[PDB]
């Protein structure tokens, strides 16, 4: 729902989401072949 929703917020008051007591896989977020730009500083996108 954070990615696919009916509408978003503005920049002066944006949505803040915390991921706690959960688990996910960042492998599906990389092979989507639908993103325009993808920058990931601080760590490698394939070794995080």
Partner 1 sequence: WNSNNLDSKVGGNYNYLYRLFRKSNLKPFERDISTEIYQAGSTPCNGVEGFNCYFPLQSYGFQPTNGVGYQPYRVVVLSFELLHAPATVCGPKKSTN
Q: Which residues bind partner 1 (CB under 8 A)?
A: 30-31, 37-38, 40, 44-46
Instruction: Count CA atoms within 13 Å of residue 24 on its CB side.
Output: 9
Least distance CB 25 / partner 1 (angstroms): 14
Q: How far apart are CA 22 and CA 29, in angstroms?
A: 16
Least distance CB 16 / partner 1 (angstroms): 27
Contact at 8 Å (CB) between 38 and 45? yes
Name which of 13 and 43 has its Cβ closer to partner 1: 43
Name which of 4 and 36 has its Cβ closer to partner 1: 36
16: which 2 tokens? 């803040």
């Amino acid at each position: 729902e954070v990615f696919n929703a009916t509408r978003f917020a503005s920049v002066y008051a944006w949505n803040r989401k915390r991921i706690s007591n959960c688990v996910a896989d960042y492998s599906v977020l990389y092979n989507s072949a639908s993103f325009s730009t993808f920058k990931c500083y601080g760590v490698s996108p394939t070794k995080l």
